[model samples]
Target: SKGEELFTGVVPILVELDGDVNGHKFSVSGEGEGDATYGKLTLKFICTTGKLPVPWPTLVTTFVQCFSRYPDHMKRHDFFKSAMPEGYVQERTIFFKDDGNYKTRAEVKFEGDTLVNRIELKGIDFKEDGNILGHKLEYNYNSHNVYIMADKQKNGIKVNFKIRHNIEDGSVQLADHYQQNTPIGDGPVLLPDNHYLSTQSALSKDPNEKRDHMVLLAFVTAAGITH
Candidate 1:
């Protein structure tokens, strides 16, 4: 019951706006817990026009460039790759330029309904120009696909994948990854802090344009219990 208390109260605040301006109408919204442990804000724009517009695509391309102020936000999702099919074994390695150069290698094996396996990060030699800046971060994630209530109304289907990170170290955390809700832009399409300005700028620069629409909805936390 205690855990349920936290889960019920962890609702994210969402603000959405939709309208038409000069034959162009789009919608934008954001969702996030006000707390620091876990949250993300997203902005989405959709074109009502059947014919593609010119400026729309360019605006999407440049959205991320405006995110210079939110470097931490950028890094949060950088580590995530595409979701592999279940029972697939995937290996990936990344090399750093600095001497304390460290390499991170991850192997994921997907079972029928869950991802069961380990992911490890090993520290490499530290030398002049080789100092790795961050600690070797490795975690094993076991994930399952589940259906969740789409919103407070609890009427729609929210297809989600549940993930458990760092399972071996007893620091396991849970996260859910949902389909993207908005289209991609040149720059960061999701700007929690400067969403208004970002959207206005994009619209102004491009009078009317058609662009892809996709958005990502997920919540993650180091706190094991959902609540």
Candidate 2:
């Protein structure tokens, strides 16, 4: 219930960076609605230096392959489905059909060579009484305070960084899921339900009050970094 309250109360902010390196920048900020809680998330994209076949094609391909191996059921979640439609079903393969509007959306403020900010991915909106009804799912990926290092050793760019997820409730985390590392993909990858329980004994009786719960999911690829 606390988390849900936090999500509803907070207003998310997205900031896009300037300069056409063919990349985007963005940031998000706010508190959960029910109770007063704070949260922030971000995302960044660095284009490869090479002029040959653009890196977006390769990146999308790698994302598709890594996504296909995930369990069929994992892709059904509202949060996962909204952000990652390319990897929704196990047997179905959706090719990257360029609609001509393939530009990335993000927010970034440059301080010299380094960019500082965050990116918020729009969450899924499900109708309560309609065909698709359940919970209102939204997520923020934090990119602030973390260092994003880009290298151009090969033809493409190698981006290294971290991210965080703010879940309105423990329902998704209760699912006890995780994803494996792939050569070209970062994750909220699907993992088997380990049946792990929260050590905190917080619980609510009112179904409508369940939105008060909140949990922060963080991921970092750098060494010796913990939150």
Candidate 3:
């Protein structure tokens, strides 16, 4: 619905950004969640330093349903549930994607592995066949330039993407499309802001792996990068 898409919804989100850059221990913070005009489901970042661990809204949701709430996109989804006595599921039996999974890990381009000259968060890409703004997205780490590793647990995941618009190419192309200019700091921060809100809003409404799979990819993307 166009009406729904226009609204951010009511959900509070907060993410602490910190990582290593040339031995530079930089720290920043982003706070906000999908909201209905009350606030931007915005992840507003601010520089800070401490021993505080990130409290990703995503971790609160079971599985990766990409719901209206609970959305952090860095680090792989940890689907393992705490053991309930006499459990039917295996303790170590996590599903679909893991932090260790390298299926769609960003192509860590290396110039001769020369201590990696620079690592930049040049934003992620998205690809949709029948749906441009549908849950049918393809992210740079998972939605674009995607590479789904081989496994029986894999589905709905697109590997090796050939994209139409990669956000990086300023071309004879898409116009008046860019705004906000959210600065994803010098780290592997979760939550791709607008995309996070849009995709997450739709995904959460579903009660299937379609939602979780997208979450899995975000987790995969996060794990592959820094912080």
Candidate 4:
């Protein structure tokens, strides 16, 4: 009916996030239009790490030891004074470097707000005259046992999946191989014959985990982002 009233006034999908990485600050401004016509997935993420009570997992393990320079300075300064957040007053800057200036900027808006030039992930399921998109579902790329290797990392890839959302059998499944073995803390290990081995079976390895949580678990359970 006139494209469902122009998809009901099309325009409410914003996700802008400003950032600083080394000094650790992020502001994610948000709005949502399609949690299947918005029953969920609104957003808020706040992290203000100053005055050194700094317990956001020791600023993510010293920001993954600042580009994995990998030396646990006294086990992240002994878990930063063994988790100090009660009175929290020992601030002479107890080590958390990487202030050589880091930056990240993001934008992804829709229609009325513009911006989003092609952010796609469609294993099909986008029909027109044959009628679909009544908030599309039921797309089965091999019953969604999705797998991807892609561009090895001068880009990104950390996609080990499993999102079998079966709301009493409406159905969904996308498992990137897991009869077992999916380690990643000595870096890269997702075998069951998908391969990308290196849990320190080294001749010189250490790559993967460029932090692209790699999306697809049937688009993270149809974008509710996993329950």
Q: How accurate is candidate 3 locally (lDDT)?
A: 0.23
Q: Whose TM-score is greatest here?
A: 3
Candidate 4's residue-wise lDDT over 97-196, tens digit each? 2112112111222335321211111112222321121222232232223232322332222223332322224644222222111111232311221222
TM-scores across all candidates? 0.20, 0.20, 0.25, 0.20
Error in Å for residue 122 of model 4: 2.8
Off by over 4 Å in 1: 1-86, 127-227
- Which 10 consecutive positions of candidate 3 have the poorest summed lDDT? 81-90
Q: Which stretches of candidate 4 lie over 4 Å from their true place?
A: 1-13, 16-118, 125-155, 170-172, 175-227
Per-residue accuracy of model 3 over 120-213 as CA lDDT, tens digit each = 1111122222122222222222122222221223211212222232222332111111111111122221222112222222122124422112
- Residue 159 in candidate 4 has what lDDT? 25
Model 1 residue 12 lDDT score: 35
Worst 10 residues of 4 by lDDT: 61-70
CA-lDDT, candidates in order: 0.26, 0.22, 0.23, 0.21
184: Cα error in model 2, Å: 19
Q: Score candidate 1 by lDDT.
A: 0.26
Model 3 TM-score relative to the real fold: 0.25
Distance from true position, residue 225, model 2, in Å?
A: 17
**Deviating ranges (above 4 Å) for candidate 2:** 1-104, 107-109, 112-115, 118-125, 128-219, 222-227
